[PDB]
Amino acid sequence: ASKRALVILAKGAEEMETVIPVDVMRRAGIKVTVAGLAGKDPVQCSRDVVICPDASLEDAKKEGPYDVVVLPGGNLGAQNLSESAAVKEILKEQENRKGLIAAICAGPTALLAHEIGFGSKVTTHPLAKDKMMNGGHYTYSENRVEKDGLILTSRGPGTSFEFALAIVEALNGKEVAAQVKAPLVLK
Amino acid sequence: ASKRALVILAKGAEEMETVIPVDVMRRAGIKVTVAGLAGKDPVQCSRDVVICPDASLEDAKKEGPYDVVVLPGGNLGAQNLSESAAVKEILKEQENRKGLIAAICAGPTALLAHEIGFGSKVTTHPLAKDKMMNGGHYTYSENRVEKDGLILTSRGPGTSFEFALAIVEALNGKEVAAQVKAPLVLK
Numbered sequence: 282a283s284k285r286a287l288v289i290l291a292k293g294a295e296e297m298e299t300v301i302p303v304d305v306m307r308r309a310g311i312k313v314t315v316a317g318l319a320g321k322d323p324v325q326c327s328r329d330v331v332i333c334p335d336a337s338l339e340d341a342k343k344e345g346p347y348d349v350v351v352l353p354g355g356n357l358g359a360q361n362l363s364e365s366a367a368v369k370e371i372l373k374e375q376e377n378r379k380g381l382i383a384a385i386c387a388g389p390t391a392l393l394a395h396e397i398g399f400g401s402k403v404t405t406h407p408l409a410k411d412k413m414m415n416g417g418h419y420t421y422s423e424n425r426v427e428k429d430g431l432i433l434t435s436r437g438p439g440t441s442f443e444f445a446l447a448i449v450e451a452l453n454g455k456e457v458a459a460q461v462k463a464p465l466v467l468k
Numbered sequence: 469a470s471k472r473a474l475v476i477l478a479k480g481a482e483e484m485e486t487v488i489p490v491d492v493m494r495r496a497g498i499k500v501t502v503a504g505l506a507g508k509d510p511v512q513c514s515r516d517v518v519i520c521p522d523a524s525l526e527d528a529k530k531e532g533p534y535d536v537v538v539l540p541g542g543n544l545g546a547q548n549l550s551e552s553a554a555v556k557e558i559l560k561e562q563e564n565r566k567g568l569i570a571a572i573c574a575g576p577t578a579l580l581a582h583e584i585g586f587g588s589k590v591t592t593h594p595l596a597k598d599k600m601m602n603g604g605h606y607t608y609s610e611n612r613v614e615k616d617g618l619i620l621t622s623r624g625p626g627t628s629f630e631f632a633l634a635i636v637e638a639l640n641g642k643e644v645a646a647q648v649k650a651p652l653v654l655k
Contacts, residue, residue: 304515331520439654467626
């Protein structure tokens with residue numbers, strides 16, 4: 282059976298960091314579920330791009346464990362993610378059952394909020410280092426993509442492809458990653 | 469003053485090639501109008517991402533002149549763009565009034581279908597080279613981004629950022645582009 286991914290779409294999420302991973306993972310054969318933090322209602326992202334979720338986070342949660350939970354960036358989205366109890370549940374479960382967690386840009390701040398992965402060496406969008414380090418609950422990295430255990434973090438929109446390909450590699454392997462990266466015409 | 473952009477979103481369009489340009493241009497202060505080809509209804513992109521257009525193409529055609537018309541890629545999306553008599557008119561007139569036209573990946577083939585910018589130097593996804601060069605109506609280019617006057621083309625998803633920033637530069641000068649590229653954490 283195909284690998285499964287859960288992308289939590291919160292109003293104000295950076296649409297590039299949302300779409301790039303969804304697209305790339307789906308190219309990898311991963312079955313992605315774009316869940317709206319507030320029902321299946323269309324979601325307005327950081328730059329007013331409107332995306333319709335496949336389902337609601339409520340109905341999505343009911344779909345057992347996923348091989349990866351993806352947290353998009355975007356300040357407003359990162360706040361909404363950080364203030365959701367339903368999101369803490371998902372992250373607690375994913376962490377306890379040893380499932381991968383991926384967050385990019387401002388997304389990792391949603392981890393500090395729900396106290397997910399303390400001690401983990403992570404990275405974020407440069408303009409969120411101090412906040413992510415607010416408490417000394419992590420070790421900071423400057424790497425475009427950072428994978429420490431089941432905590433995968435990235436820097437921003439311009440690292441979304443690397444971020445997404447890092448996820449594909451972790452779930453489906455390096456062969457599947459290279460194949461998905463072929464037609465993309467990257468660096 | 470504030471430049472305006474027309475992004476024609478059609479069923480099957482590559483969502484990364486659609487979102488990256490829209491997001492980047494807006495970050496650059498450009499007024500972007502994502503207009504749906506078939507209408508005002510949400511459109512299913514190549515990898516099943518669902519995007520809600522800002523308006524139908526019909527209504528957008530009324531919204532004043534656009535400094536740049538952007539054609540996202542994606543097989544089906546491009547195909548739908550190429551078979552659209554409405555898209556033809558829009559392109560012909562943008563060209564005539566010396567307005568910038570931008571197409572990426574398979575998007576360039578729409579220019580061919582509508583005989584737009586014949587004789588120009590262009591690039592496309594490697595897999596659409598022969599198709600684009602059938603009839604020798606253009607000079608092909610290997611560059612990740614090719615700007616031949618008012619005709620700007622690009623290769624694929626992985627060149628979406630350069631493609632977008634090139635548009636921003638073409639409309640707001642290399643100054644604004646520099647400011648927009650800065651927070652993206654690109655290569």
